[model samples]
Target: ETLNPSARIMTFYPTMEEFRNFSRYIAYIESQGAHRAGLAKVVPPKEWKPRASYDDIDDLVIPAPIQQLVTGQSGLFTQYNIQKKAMTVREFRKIANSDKYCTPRYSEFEELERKYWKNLTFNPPIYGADVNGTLYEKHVDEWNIGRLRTILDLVEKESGITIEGVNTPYLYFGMWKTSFAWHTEDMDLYSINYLHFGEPKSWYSVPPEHGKRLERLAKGFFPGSAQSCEAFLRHKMTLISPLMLKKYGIPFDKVTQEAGEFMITFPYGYHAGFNHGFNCAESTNFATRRWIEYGKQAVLCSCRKDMVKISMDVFVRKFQPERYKLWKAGKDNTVIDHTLPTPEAAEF
Candidate 1:
């Protein structure tokens, strides 16, 4: 199969509050999960290990979320907070000016990561840089749930597509990033993604020629660009985030659903991932790091919770087939929401 790079431009709509809250929510999530667990059990070079060895410390196993019930410690959520705080400080640094003002991106936690990277255990790099990276994010971050619901409602009402069912109106988060790369929900259901928060820069690509690429093109709506091309391992193509996208030829919309979600017609076919290195930096580092150590612990718990089927009340509040491939939500079909649940759908 083949693909066309430039066919038409896409437009995503976002409410001012969602736009802002999404940013903050992303910050909170980043603050929580983006904790720099520091690469471990990751797939390394040939000399590093066997070509396809799966079991190892390089493979991370984030623990579940703990609460008032008292179930001991949740390794994943704890680290999640770390990442969240790290991103929060970074975000703060970009917008904050006064000393009294606090933000994750610039807060003291970053210093902690800087100081702790040397001591971080089970180090492994999700990106090439992660090969020699530092710990980031770690804390609790929060925003209104209603605000998130509003954005979901609006997307369903406007896009005419749905990620969750009508009865499922709630929203939470998990966040899976890593250059291991490409994030397109399967063709099993209709999903309207809100790239809530992520690196100011991200990657997204699809074939413009539907027939050529779509024909026998595995199964999902968009096949993995990295997987689709053999050179991906070498090319290290990334949908560079906002600033970089603007700098180059790619378009970036971290806050826009159009930039986040994709309808999968061929679930089995597409592939995408982040690059962690000199060429590109991609991976789930952002989510897990920002959760515990910083302060975005709320969303982490959402992982185990079933995503609600959204209930919308507008003609525009439906999935539009012409515009997007229906994700076709179902009990089994789910989005990569939160990660603090007893178990995460996404193994990461």
Candidate 2:
């Protein structure tokens, strides 16, 4: 299928407010110091500026309302990460019945999930999981995925990317209370994720030459014959070391100029979100500057959430306190450095 040409990639194209909100949330996450991401607040759009470039993101805009809210915030993402409310990998893998982990967070939720699965006499999922994640199943309860279907239709019609396909791996064992190590997303097709209810972090990239190289490297390191990822991350452990990519033919030095705009390698650049995600009505359904969302059920029965919370705490949250002191001495220090050369340095 010829893609829409406009819809296959992803970027950090947030509005000015979103950028500022992102930075602030990142700042809080940075303060946690690797012990537990002390971050626990959803960024408010009202507390930001529409920055034209990432250079001034630090001083962009911190609205008073946002500052007030972030003083000591508390939300699900923050609570989940810091307080350990979510299950561990071992705990999650123990469930033989995916229905046991279903989002029966409430009476109505329990009822709906039970009713939804009562009719299916299908065989057990590979990991004892039903595809319905606790975090996201609420979208059906909210009827938001219905609206998601509508938007997805337009995207499929306009962009030509199939927006539904969450069939095989019904259990999202790779995430939640698990020992899942985060990585980049699947580059096979033009994918779409609909977060109508829960907010988890996601890392994705464009189909740039650099990205394709990264995939080839991933394939080389993860030249799969195994059925489970448990063995992949643990047993074969050859995929992650810098040496793995070095062996995969990606130069360990630099990806220099890009076919598109930037070279993130894997989850290093152009990703999304900080912890303590925003409201349901606002985030996934809001007017995004870039990226696409497929149907709610078919995105991925997967684990991008690890990237969301971990990235914030690592790149955005944990680096700030000293970033200010060190960045003043040398500006291009942080990971999201958008510093540009002077006009004299511009040869292009």
Candidate 3:
């Protein structure tokens, strides 16, 4: 039997010492061309452990709103019409564990409709923030990849503003067949996701170099959506399987993130995947100095008019005032000259 070709993602097993200095380690990996794959997996040291036990947290309840995704007959190749509904974690989990949520063998990507209870954002109470009556307790900082010092930390430290879902983490509860469609990180920033507990997640990624090609192919596949909005993919409603992508001649890679493992997506890399079963994960966007150029190049879509965009110009100005001033004066500022866009250029 012929199998689908998988994209090459380099996985690393870092020592405790190496894992502690995550930013440096990842930078070294990128230097060695790990970014070419667009996604990389980092397995934590064996001695590492979560601050909270899953068994203790199982009885706790929280809000797990539903996203009703309608993907007509074509299943894996069409645009999804999504509708939102309110629900609770316990309720959703019961439904997820039931046979109704189970996909039949050999019918993995052929679902006509899916009800996803995902993207339920929470700030872990570990850091002294009131969890707002939610009894769930986990050592979020241990798994929060954003907490690791990256270039984004400089902006946050200087500006004194928290970048929600970027510097701060968002938790997701996923079940069988629940999916995230193809899309890049907000502001084209780097994203890191850690599966805290439960089943592994199946991921497919397109390298940054082929991002434009993927967009073109998506437009060709969904012409109506493309015609309505140039950034239709940004809506995160499109899900074209790896098999279909390969058929279209687009390069794609795959990874399965298990509990305690981290999956990192490089800037401008397009990724989409689904959970194997009931699982909870934490994810956030972070940036390196290298991502400054990508952030500068990111465009806000008119279709997402109400979307809050993190202004790269403002971040640059706050993080590197002297360099920004020098660049503005057209002086010999070698550092941020090419990497950052002018405030006027980046402004809406």
Clashes in model 3: which pairs?
7-253
Which ten residues in a row are the worst by lDDT in model 2? 64-73
- Arranged by TM-score with the best first, the candidates are 3, 2, 1
User: Candidate 1 on 184-302: residue-level lDDT in tens?
Assistant: 22211112222222232223333212222422222221145324542222122222222232343332122112112311111111233221111212122111121121111111112
The 10-residue segment of model 3 with minimum total lDDT is 122-131
Give the per-residue lDDT of model 2 (tens digit) for 1-348.
Answer: 122222232223334443334223222222221101101122223332222232222221211111101111111011111122333333433432255333223353334323322311222122211233223233232213223332223333444434222211112222111111222223211122322222232222222324335544444444552233322221211213233335554432211111112112221111222211211111122111111111111122232232111111222122245444453454533222111211222222
State which candidate, 1 or 2, has the greater lDDT: 2
Each candidate's lDDT (Cα)?
Answer: 0.24, 0.24, 0.63
Model number with the top TM-score: 3
How close is every model to the real structure, measured as TM-score?
Answer: 0.24, 0.26, 0.77
lDDT of 3: 0.63
Candidate 2: regions farther than 4 A off? 1-130, 133-207, 218-239, 246-348
Deviation from truth (RMSD, Å), model 3: 8.5
Q: List residue ranges in candidate 1 displaced over 4 A.
A: 1-6, 9-177, 180-183, 188-198, 207-271, 275-348
Off by over 4 Å in 3: 1-7, 59-64, 73-88, 103-143, 315-348
